[PDB]
Amino acid sequence: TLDVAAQCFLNSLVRETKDWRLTEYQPTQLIIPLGEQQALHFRVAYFSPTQHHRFEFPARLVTASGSHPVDFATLSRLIVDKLQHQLLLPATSCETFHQRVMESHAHTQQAIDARHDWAALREKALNFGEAEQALLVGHAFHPAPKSHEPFNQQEAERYLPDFAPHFPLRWFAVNKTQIAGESLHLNLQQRLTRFAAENAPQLLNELSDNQWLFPLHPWQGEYLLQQEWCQELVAKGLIKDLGEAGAPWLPTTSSRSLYCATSRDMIKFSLSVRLTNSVRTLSVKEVKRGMRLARLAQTDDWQTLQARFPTFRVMQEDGWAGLRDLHGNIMQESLFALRENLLVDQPQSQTNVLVSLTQAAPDGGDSLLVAAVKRLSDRLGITAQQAAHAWVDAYCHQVLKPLFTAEADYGLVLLAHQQNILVQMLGDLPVGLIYRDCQGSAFMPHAAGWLDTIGEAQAENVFTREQLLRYFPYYLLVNSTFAVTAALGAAGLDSEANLMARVRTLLAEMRDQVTHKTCLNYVLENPYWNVKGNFFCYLNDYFDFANPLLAQ
Amino acid sequence: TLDVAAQCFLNSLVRETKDWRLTEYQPTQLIIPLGEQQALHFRVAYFSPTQHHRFEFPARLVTASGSHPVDFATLSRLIVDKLQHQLLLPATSCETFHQRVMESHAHTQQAIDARHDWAALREKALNFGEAEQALLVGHAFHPAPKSHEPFNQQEAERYLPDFAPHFPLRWFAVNKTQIAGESLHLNLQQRLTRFAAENAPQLLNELSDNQWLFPLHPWQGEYLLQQEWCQELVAKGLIKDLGEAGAPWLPTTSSRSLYCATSRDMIKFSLSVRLTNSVRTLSVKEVKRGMRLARLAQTDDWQTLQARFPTFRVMQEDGWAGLRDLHGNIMQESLFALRENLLVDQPQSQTNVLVSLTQAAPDGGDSLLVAAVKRLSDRLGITAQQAAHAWVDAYCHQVLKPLFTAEADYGLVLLAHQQNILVQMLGDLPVGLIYRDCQGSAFMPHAAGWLDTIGEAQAENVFTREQLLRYFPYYLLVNSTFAVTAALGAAGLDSEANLMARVRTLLAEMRDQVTHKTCLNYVLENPYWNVKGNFFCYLNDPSVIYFDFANPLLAQ
Amino acid sequence: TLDVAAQCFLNSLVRETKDWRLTEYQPTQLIIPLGEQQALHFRVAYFSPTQHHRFEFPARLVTASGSHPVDFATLSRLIVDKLQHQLLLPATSCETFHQRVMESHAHTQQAIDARHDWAALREKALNFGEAEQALLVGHAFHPAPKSHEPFNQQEAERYLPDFAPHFPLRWFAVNKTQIAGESLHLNLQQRLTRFAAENAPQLLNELSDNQWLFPLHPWQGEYLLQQEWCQELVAKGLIKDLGEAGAPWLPTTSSRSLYCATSRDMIKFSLSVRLTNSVRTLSVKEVKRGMRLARLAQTDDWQTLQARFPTFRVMQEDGWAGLRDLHGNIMQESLFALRENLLVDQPQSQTNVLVSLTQAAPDGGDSLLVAAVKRLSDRLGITAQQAAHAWVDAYCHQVLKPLFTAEADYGLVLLAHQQNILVQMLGDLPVGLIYRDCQGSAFMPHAAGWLDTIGEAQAENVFTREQLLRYFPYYLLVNSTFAVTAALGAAGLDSEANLMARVRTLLAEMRDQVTHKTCLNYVLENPYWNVKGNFFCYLNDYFDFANPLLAQ
Ligand SMILES: Nc1ncnc2c1ncn2[C@@H]1O[C@H](COP(=O)(O)OP(=O)(O)OP(=O)(O)O)[C@@H](O)[C@H]1O
Ligand SMILES: Nc1ncnc2c1ncn2[C@@H]1O[C@H](COP(=O)(O)OP(=O)(O)OP(=O)(O)O)[C@@H](O)[C@H]1O
Ligand SMILES: Nc1ncnc2c1ncn2[C@@H]1O[C@H](COP(=O)(O)OP(=O)(O)OP(=O)(O)O)[C@@H](O)[C@H]1O
Ligand SMILES: [Mg+2]
Ligand SMILES: [Mg+2]
Ligand SMILES: [Mg+2]
C-alpha cells in the first residue's frame, strides 16, 4: 500500500513539472497525463504545498477501455517513455536512468526488510551514530537516492549506513616520503600518530620516524593496493599492508564519512562510488577548502561570531592526508580529511542529523521528528501542536539564525541542507547547531578583508550575490526547513501553511537585526526562488519555485 | 588570611548600614567605626558595588595612638556591643546572636577541613547532587548562614549537605485512618505505594489495603516516635516502626529537601531545625500552595506559558502527606511534600543550583561558576570575558525572561532565590531553567480570572502590587543575578558595572514585550529598592528591618 | 553449501537410527539407505562421536541408474516416505510432520537473513539478553526446532527471540476476586504491586484495594480477551483493559519467558503456542513446583548446599498468578510465573545461556563459544587448545559438580539441558552457574526427610531411581556437556574424544566425594544410556545410547 522509495521519484517529478492535475471530487487524486488519451491516477493521502506528498498505492493507469493497477516498475517506465517522446531525449540516457531508478527502489526495499529495529527507534532519543544510520529513504527529492554503483550487495551491506554495519579501518605502514598532507595544532606526523594511537594502538609497533601509520577505507584500501602505482611502492618497500585493526567505525549518512565514538577525529575518505550523481572521491582542492575555513576559525572575527552564537559549532576539517606515487604525484583516490569529533566527550547526546528526523517512516508510522515532538509534548504537558510550534521556533533560532547571520554580518556562507545540519537537542528541543561538510563553505565579497587576515581573500570558493541567492535559500529552506514543516504537517500537528507562517515571522525579526539584508529580503519578498531539480539533472548524466513565505 | 564565613557577617553588615567609610589612601581599607575614637580597619582585596566584598584578614583595631590585630570572635563581639548601645538592645538577644554567629563560623571551618574533594569540583561539570552539596559558605549575606540548632556535631555530619552525606529513609507502616494527604494523577494511596516501591521495595511485605508505608526523615522520625500521640498509635497498633531502609538520599542545599537519583520523586520534610531565621517545619497551609500551583499547571494557560518557554520547568509539588493523631489532628511535624524529580531520566545533566556556582571559593580560588565559564571559553576557543558575557546573556534569556514574563503576562509570581534557581547547562552554557520551591509561589490580581478556572481565586498566596515590588526584584536581581555578575567581577573577567549593563539592556528589551510593565519599570528606573535585611532580622528573632537598596541598573 | 536447519533434521535422524553407514574411502560420505537399491549420500565435513555432524550440501541420491543432487525438501520427503512404511506410519500424521519440518527450515532462513548483526556477536562478550536472542538454529537434535504454530510471520517477528524484538506488556485492571495466585516474601497483592510499579508506573492510577494490576503477554492477552468467559468479566466490570504499557520486554530462547533488564522479576507466561512438541501453556501443577522449590530454598539444608557452592544459584519462581472465570475456576491460559532476575544488578555480566554458545554458526564460522575461548586465549597468552581445556575444566567444576552433588548429597534433581544452564563467565572463563526453569526440578527418595521440613515429601515431582538414571544424564551430559565438547571439536581445538576424557576424569573425582554414587556410577560404567528420540517423538504427536564415558 505504501512505498517511500517510489514517492521520491514521484515527488521529485511533480515538483519539477507543471504538467499534472488534481481532481475536484473526493477522494482527491493526482493525475499525470501520459498523452495518447491515457494517464496515471495516484490517490493522495496527504497533499503538501511543498510537494512532500504521500500517495496511496498501487497507482492506476486509465485507458479508453477502463482502468487498471500498475506497479512502480511499470508506471516509472511509462513516465520515462513520455518524457523521452514529449521532450525528445536520447534513448540510451533514458534507459540507464530508468535502470538506476529501479535499482535504488529495490535497494531501498532490501534495507527496509533488513532493518527490523527501525520502528523501535521511535521509542527514545537517538544519539549521533543511531541517527546517521537511520536514513533508509535517502534524498526525498531525488529520483534514485539509493544507487551505489559499483558496489555489490555484500559491499553495500558492510560499507553503507543503511544496514547499520561497523568495521575497523585498514592500515598501511608508509614511508613519509610517500605521505602528503596538512594539519593544524598538531603537525601531520603528530595527527597520524595520535589518530593511530587512539584507534589502533596495537599497530604502534610499526611506527617510526620515517614509517608512519596511514588509515584507509577497507574498500578503497583493497582498491588502491591492486593499482600498479601503489604496488610499485610495495615493491620498493615504501608501503607495508597491516590489514584491518582497531576500533569500530560506522559509515554515516554520506557513507564516505566514518564515525568512531571514542576517536577525537572522524574521517572522510576519497571513495570511488557514485552516490546521487557524483563519484565520491576527494580532490586536493576540496580538502584545502576545509583547511581554509579551519584557519579562518582561529581569527578574532570568528572568535566574535562564536561568542555571539555559543550553541553554534562547526566541525572543522583541519587535517588531511593522501598517498604520493613514486614520482610524488598525490593520488587523489587515497585522500582523506580529518573532521573534529565534537561529540567525543558526549557520545550519547541527542545530536541528530536532520535528514533522518524528517524522512517519512517506511512503515508509514511516525517520522523520528514527530516522535521527538510527541515526547516533548508529553514531557512539558503541552499539546502536540504546541510542541510542534516550539520545536519549529527553536529550530529557527538555533539553526537558521546563525546561518543567515553568518552570511549577513560576516559574509560566511554555509550551504546547510538536511545532511549537513546536526540538530543539538536536549529533551527533544533544539538547543544548538553543529554544521558539517566544509566543502559547503563559501565567502561573500564582504568577507574579503577578513580572508586577508589569513591571506585567502582570493579564495576559490567565493560567491557572487547571484550565486548566493540561487543556492542558499534552496538548501536552508526548501531542502531543510520545509521538510521539518512538511513532516509535522503530514502527521497533522499543524498545517504547513501555519508553520511556514511561524518561520516567516522569525525570518522577519532576523532581518531587522542583521547588516546585509540582501538574502533575507530575497527570501521574504521575491516571488520565485531558484531550485535545483535532481529529477532532470540525474536523467542527464533549474526551475523557478513559488515562494510560500510571501506576505498574504 | 582567608575567611569566607566572616565575609558573610561583614558583607551582610556593610549592606545594611551607612555607618562605614573608605580610605582615600591605598592599599584601600574599609572602616567600621566603633565610637570612642576607635575603629576596625579591613584590608580590601576586592570592592564590590553589590557588597560582595573580599577582605584580607586579620582585621585591625584602630584605637589609642596605635592598633593591633583582632580575630573574628573579637571584632564581631565589638560590633555587637556597638549595636547594643545604638539600638538599646536586650543583652540576652545580643549574646544569643553572637554565639550563633560563632557557631556558624566554626561549623563552616569544620566543613572546609572535611571537604578535601571540594577544589576538585572545579575540574569538570557538576551533576545536580554534586552542586546541591557544594555550598559550604551558605547565604552570602546572612550573619549566621550555618546555624544548625538543635543539631549536634554527629547530627550535622549526616543530615546537612556540607559533609556530602547520604542515608536511607526511615519508614513506618501506618493504618490509612492515620494518614492525611493529597495527590494528583495518582491518589494518595497510590503515590506512597509507588514511592515505597521504587525506594524501599523490601518493605512491601508490610503493604496492605489498610496498612500503608509512610516515609520519614531519620531525625524527625526518631523525634516523632518519642512523642505521646505517636506512641498512642504504636500501642493501638496503627503504627509500626520499620526502621531505616532502601535507596540512599542526599540532603540538598535546604537540608530538609532530599534527593535520590533513582527516585521519580524528591521529598521535602517538615524538619524541626533552625536554618537562617526560620524553623523548617511545614504547615498544611504551605503544602497546599504546591497543590494549588500543580492543579493550575493542568490549565491551558499554563500550557500556553510552557509552550512559549519550552526550556523553562517548574518542579511541581503535586503531593503531600502527614500523620494525624488518634483524634484525627494533622501533626505538622510529620508532614512532607513530594517534588517532581525532572532529573530522574538524566541524573548526570549539568543542572546546578545557582547558589553553589556563585559562592566564593573557601580556598580563594575559582568559584564553580568561573570554573564553568573557563571551560566554556576553552571549548569554544573564545576569551574568558567573551565566555563571561555569553554566560550572562544566556542567563538572562533562560532564567530572567520566563520569570519576568510569567508575572507580567500571566500574573504568576515565582520568588526565585539563588537557591530556587536550577541552571540547566549544556557544555557550561545555560540552555534552560528549572524552578524549585513552590512555597514561594504567589499570584497577582491579574491572575485572578485564571485561578477562577480551578476555583482558587481567593488563594491565600495572592500578592498586592507593593508586595511584588518589594520581594520580587530582591530575590531575582539582588539575591541572584548580582551574585552572578559579582562572582565574575571578583575573578576579573569583567567589571560588575559592565556586566550589569548587559543585564539592563536585555531587561529593557524584555519590558517592551510584556503586558504589565509594572515590575521591569521598577527594576530599571526606581532609584531605590526597598527590601528586607538578614543581619538585623536575625538579631531580632521596622525602619531597620527593611532598608533602601540603591539601584545599580538606573541609566547613569 | 551450508544448511544448519537441515543438519538438525539429519543429525537427529542419525542419532536415533542404526540404519546408515560410513564409506571407508575418502572423501568420507555418510549413507542413509532408502531401499530398492536407492540411498542418500552425504559428504561429511565433520564426523562427531556425539552425532554433532556437519554435512556438505547438496546431498546426492544414488541409484543403480546414476546419481543426482537433491534439495532438503526432497530428501526429507524421501526419508519421511521411508519412515512412513517402515513404521507403518499413518499417512496423515507424516504429512503434518514434514510440513512442520519445512516450516521450521524456512522460518530459520528468514531469521538468518533478518539478523545481519549476528556475525558481529563474535566480537565481544555477550550479556544475558544478547545470548537469549542469539539462538537461530534452536534445538540441534529436533527435526523442526523452529516450528511456531499458530504464530503467523508477523507474530513470529514480535514474540519469538529470533528477530531480537522487544515490547511492553499488556495490562488488565482486575477485581481481586478474579485473581488467583501466590507469592513468597511479599504476598500476592504486594508482588503485583511491585511488579507493576517498576514496569508500568503510569498505570498505577488504576491501582486500588480491590482492583489490581495484572500483567499479560501481548499475544496471549488478546487471545484471552476474545474468549466468552473473559468477556463476561469485562461486562461485569471485573476487568478493565489498559492496553500495552511500560518497560521493554524481550522474549528469551523459550519465547514464553520474558526479560526486562530493569525488573527484579522475569515473567514466564502460559502461551498457547507449540514449540518443539509441546504447547507452552502452564498448569497450576507446574507453578506449584516453582513455589515448592522456593519454599525449600528457605530451609537450613539449602543454606548448607548454597554455602558449599556459592557460585551456584537457582532462579527461584517464588510467585504466580492467574485469572478466574465467573465461577472461580482458574483459567489455565491466563497463568504466569514470576522468576528472580538475579542479573538485575549486573545487566552487562557475561552470563550466557549455554545453548546459544554451543550452536553452530549459520554462516559456518566460529561458534559463540569458540569466539569466547579465543578471547580467553588472547587475554591469557595461552594456546587456543589450552584455553579450550581450561574452559572445559572450568565448566565441569562450575556447572556439573554442584548439579550432580545436589542429587547425590541432598537428593535435589535439576534437569539442566543447555537452555536451563546459564554459564556465568568472567573474561570468557566460567566462574559460576545459574540454573533456570523449576519445572525441570525433581526430588529423590533420600530427599524426603528434607522435604518433611516443609511438608512437601508427598510431592508429585518425586523421582524413582529409574526415572533419574533415564533423564538426568541425557539433559546434563548428552544435551549439555557434549555440545560444548562437540563445538570445541568441530572447531579443531581438540578432538571430542580427548575433551570427553577430561570430563570423565573430573566426573570420576566427583564420584569419590559424594555419598550416593548411584548416578555417577551409571554415567561412568553402564555401557548404554537411555535417550530421547525427539525425531520419532515429533513424528508421533525411548532408545539406548552407547556410553562414550566408558574406560578404554
Ligand atoms: N535531502 C538531502 N540533501 C542532500 N543530500 C542528501 C539528502 N538526503 C540524502 N542525502 C545523501 O547525503 C549525501 C550528501 O553528500 P555531500 O556531498 O553533501 O556529503 P559528503 O561530502 O559526501 O560527505 P560529508 O557530508 O560527510 O562531508 C549524498 O550522498 C546523498 O545521497
Ligand atoms: N543565597 C541564598 N539565598 C537564600 N537562601 C540560601 C542562600 N544560600 C543558602 N541558602 C539556604 O537555602 C535555604 C533556603 O530557604 P527557602 O525557604 O528559600 O527554601 P526551602 O523551602 O527551605 O528549600 P527547598 O528549595 O527544598 O524548598 C536556607 O536554609 C538558606 O540557609
Ligand atoms: N538444545 C536444546 N535443548 C533444549 N531446549 C532447546 C534447545 N535448543 C533450543 N531449545 C528451546 O528451548 C525450549 C526448552 O523448553 P523448556 O520447557 O525447557 O523451557 P520453558 O519452560 O518453556 O522456558 P524457561 O526455560 O524460560 O522456563 C524449547 O522451546 C526449545 O525450542
Ligand atoms: Mg554533507
Ligand atoms: Mg528554596
Ligand atoms: Mg527450560
User: To the nearest whole angstrom, how far is the Cα of B374 from the nearest Cα of chain A?
Assistant: 13
The rounded Cα A238 to chain-centroid distance in angstroms is 37
Closest chain B residue to the Cα of C204, Cα to Cα: B190
Distance of CA C38 to the CA centre of its chain: 37
| C19 phi, psi to nearest 5 deg | -105, 80
Closest CA to C356 of C127, C55, C143: C127
Residue owning grid cell 620515517: A210
Measured N-to-C along each axis, helices C72-86 and C4-15 cross at an angle, to the nearest 10 degrees, of 20
Instruction: Confirm if B52 and B45 have CB atoms less than 8 A apart.
Output: no
Probe site for chain B from A383, A386, A392 (most B CB atoms < 10 A): A386
Bridge partners of residue B241, in order along the sequence: B172
Torsion of CA A243, A248, A249, A253, to 10 degrees: 140
DSSP H/E element including C496 = helix C496-511
Q: Which residue of B has its CA nearest to C194?
A: B197
Question: DSSP label at B519?
Answer: H
What span, in angstroms and rounded, lies between the C-alpha atoms of C53 and C490? 8
CA angle B363–B367–B372, rounded 5-degree value: 140
Ligand number nearest CA of A270 is 1
- Residue C541 CA to chain centroid, in angstroms? 20
> E-assigned strands of C34-142?
38-46, 54-63, 67-70
CB C528 within 8 A of CB C544: yes
CA-nearest residue for atom 22, ligand 3, is C254
Instruction: Tell me the sheet residues that pair with B354.
Output: none
Task: Find the radius of gyration of the CA atoms of chain B.
Answer: 24
Residue B119's domain spans which residues? Answer: 1-556
Tell me the pairing of strands A312-314 and A430-435.
Answer: parallel
Asked if B23 has any chain C CB less than 8 Å from its own CB, the reply is no
Among chain B residues, CA nearest to A311: B429
H/E segment holding residue A503: helix A496-513
Distances (CA, A) of A12 to A1, A53, A535, C389: 20, 10, 6, 63
CA angle C380, C383, C386 (to 5 degrees): 90
Contacts of C163 in chain A (CB under 8 A): 116
CA distance B195 to chain C (A): 9
The H-or-E segment that residue B286 falls in is: helix B284-296
Contact B132, B252 (CB under 8 A): yes
Pocket test for ligand 2, best of B139, B338, B532 (most atoms within 8 A of CB): B139
Residue A163 contacts C, CB cutoff 8 Å = yes
Residue C303 exposed, middle or buried by CB count within 10 Å (0-12, 13-18, 19+): exposed
Residue A110: burial class (beta carbons within 10 Å; 0-12, 13-18, 19+)? middle
| Interface size between A and C, measured as CB pairs under 8 A | 19
Which residue from C332, C182, C341, C328 is spatially nearest to C270, judged by alpha carbons?
Answer: C332
C257-259 sheet: strands from edge to edge:
C179-183, C319-323, C336-340, C265-269, C257-259, C239-251, C167-175, C211-216
Chain C residue numbers with beta carbons less than 8 Å from the beta carbon of A165 are 116
Q: Which three cell numbers stand for residue A70?
A: 500498475
CA-wise closest residue to B142 among B548, B533, B478, B543: B533
Q: Which residue has the cell 547547562?
A: B425
Hey, whose CA ends up nearest to atom 1 of ligand 2?
A: B139
Buried b (16+ CB within 10 A) or exposed e, A341-359: bbbeeeeebbbbbbbbbbb
Angstrom CA distances, A203 to A62, A200, A217, A501, stand at: 65, 6, 16, 57
Touching B (3+ Cβ pairs <8 A), the chains are: A, C
- What resolution in angstroms, rounded to 1 decimal? 2.2
Ligand 3 pocket member C253 (CB < 6 A): yes
CB atoms within 10 A of CB B158: 14
Cα separation, B338 vs B319, in Å, equals 5
Query: Which is nearest to B413 in space by CA: B382, B443, B439?
Result: B443
How many CB pairs (< 8 A) connect B and C?
44
Closest-CA residue to A478 (of A416, A385, A388): A416
State whether the Cα torsion B139-B144-B146-B148 is positive or negative.
negative
Q: What is the amino acid identity at position A93?
A: S
CA distance C393 to C386: 10
Cα(A536)–Cα(B38) distance, rounded to whole angstroms?
A: 93
List the 38-77 stretch of B: residues with Cβ below 8 A of C: none
Q: Are B255 and B159 in contact (CB under 8 A)?
A: yes
C-alpha cell at A253: 549518512
- Written as one letter, the residue type at B555 is A
Residue of chain C with shortest Cα separation from B200: C194
Under DSSP, the state recorded for B359 is S
Inform me whether the C-beta atom of residue C201 falls under 8 Å from chain B C-beta atoms.
yes
User: In whole angstroms, what separates CA A92 from the centre of its chain?
Assistant: 29
Strand partners of residue A544:
A530
What is d(CA C56, CA C2) in angstroms, rounded to the nearest whole number? 7
Of B15, B179, B12, nearest to B550 by C-alpha is: B15
Three-state helix/strand/coil letters over A303-353: HHHHHHCCCEEECCCCEEEEEECCCCCEEEEEEEEEEECCCCCCCCCCEEE
Spatial contact of C534 and C139, defined as CB atoms under 8 Å apart: yes
DSSP string, A92-154: HHHHHHHHHHHHHHHHHHHHHHH-SSGGGGGGS---HHHHHT---S--TT-SSTT--TT--HH
B496-511 vs B482-490: helix crossing angle, rounded to 10: 150
Q: What angle do CA C152, C156, C157 make, to 5 degrees?
A: 125
Burial class (CB in 10 A: 0-12, 13-18, 19+), B49: middle
Test C264 with B197 for CB contact under 8 angstroms. Answer: no
Judged by a CB distance cut-off of 8 A, whether residue B387 touches chain A is yes
| 3-state class (DSSP) for residue A531 | strand
Tell me how far the alpha carbon of residue B495 is from its chain's centroid: 26
Round to whole Å and give the CA distance between B104 and B108: 6
Q: Whose CA is nearest to atom 1 of ligand 3?
A: C139
- Contact between chains at C117 and A164 (C-beta distance less than 8 A): yes
Q: From the list B185, B189, B204, which residue is nearest C194 (CB)?
A: B204
Q: Is A148 in the pocket of ligand 1 (CB under 6 A)?
A: no
Under an 8 A CB cutoff, do B190 and C207 touch?
yes
B258 Cβ inside 6 Å of ligand 2:
no
Q: Which of B253, B268, B419 to mutate to test the pocket of ligand 2 (most atoms within 8 A of CB)?
A: B419
Angle CA A52–A54–A55, to nearest 5: 140
Chain C CB contacts of A164 below 8 Å: 116-117
Distance from C-alpha of C483 to C-alpha of C50, rounded to nearest angstrom: 8
CA distance A171 to A215: 5
Question: Under a CB-based contact definition with an 8 Å cutoff, are residues B137 and B5 in contact?
Answer: yes
Residue B254 Cα to ligand 2 middle (Å): 5
When scoring B186, B198, B204 by the number of chain C Cβ atoms within 10 A, the one with the most, hence best to mutate, is B204
Q: Is B177 on the interface with C (CB under 8 A)?
A: no
CA–CA dist B390, B494 (Å, integer) = 12
The answer to whether C219 touches C239, Cβ cutoff 8 Å, is no
C-alpha cell at B433: 531553567
* Proximal ligand: closest to the CA of A475: 1
Task: Collect all residues with Cβ–Cβ distance below 8 Å to B137 and sequence separation of at least 6.
Answer: B4, B5, B8, B108, B145, B359, B360, B362
Question: Cβ of C253: how many Cβ atoms within 10 Å?
Answer: 22
Alpha-carbon gap, residue B535 to B39, rounded angstroms: 20
Run of H or E including C522? helix C518-525
In angstroms, the separation between the Cα of residue C256 and the nearest Cα of chain A is 21
Report how far ligand 4's centroid is from the alpha carbon of A253 (Å).
8
Distances (CA, A) of A180 to A200, A284, A319, A331, A479: 21, 10, 11, 9, 36
Chains in contact with C, counting 3 or more C-beta pairs less than 8 Å apart as contact: A, B
Quick one: DSSP state of residue A445? G
Residue A327 — φ and ψ, nearest 5°? -90, -20
Q: Please, what is the Cα angle at A355 between A342 and A271, to 5 degrees?
A: 70
Give B42→chain C minimum CA distance, Å: 57
Nearest CA to ligand 3 atom 26: C257
Q: Which one, of A529, A530, A523, lies nearest residue A550 by Cα? A: A523
Write out chain C residues lying below 8 Å of A157, CB-based. Answer: 116
The set of cell numbers assigned to A265 is 577525529
**Residue located nearest, by CA, to atom 20 of ligand 1:** A254
Q: How far is C114 from chain A (nearest CA, A)?
A: 5
Selected residue of A299, A305, A377, A382 to mutate for chain B interface (largest B Cβ count, 10 A): A382
Which residue has 499554563 as its cell numbers? Answer: B302
As a whole number of angstroms, the distance between CA A447 and CA A293 comes to: 12
Q: Which residue of B has its CA nearest to A390?
A: B307
Q: Is the CB of A218 under 6 A from ligand 1?
A: no
Interacting residues of A285 by C-beta distance below 8 A, sequence separation 6+ = A460
Half-sphere exposure (Cβ direction) of B83: Cα atoms closer than 13 Å: 22
Which helix (H) or strand (E) segment holds residue C107: the answer is: helix C91-114
Number of domains observed in the structure of chain B: 1
Strands (E), B88-157: none
A134: nearest Cα among A347, A343, A358 = A358
Q: How close are the terminal C-alpha atoms of chain C, in Å?
A: 37
The H-or-E segment that residue C545 falls in is strand C543-546
Cα dihedral: A73, A79, A80, A82 (round 10): 140
Question: Among B273, B163, B165, B289, which Cα is nearest to B219's?
Answer: B273
Strands (E), B270-361: 271-274, 279-280, 312-314, 319-324, 330-340, 350-353
Distance A531 CA to ligand 2 centre (A): 58
**Residue B11 CB less than 6 A away from ligand 2:** no
Angle at C258 between CA C439 and CA B208, to 5 degrees: 85
In this complex, is the C-beta atom of C165 within 8 Å of any C-beta atom belonging to chain A?
Answer: yes
Instruction: At B63, give phi and psi (nearest 5°).
Output: -115, -110
Nearest to C157 among A116, A164, A166 (CB): A116
Q: Is A548 in contact with A531 (CB distance < 8 Å)?
A: no
8 A C-beta contact, residue A385 and residue A493: yes
Tell me, rounded to whole angstroms, the distance of Cα B368 from its chain centroid.
17
Q: List Cβ neighbours of A162 (8 Å cut-off, separation of 6 or more).
A: A107, A111, A114, A115, A133, A135, A136, A146, A156
Strand bridging mode C430-435 / C312-314:
parallel
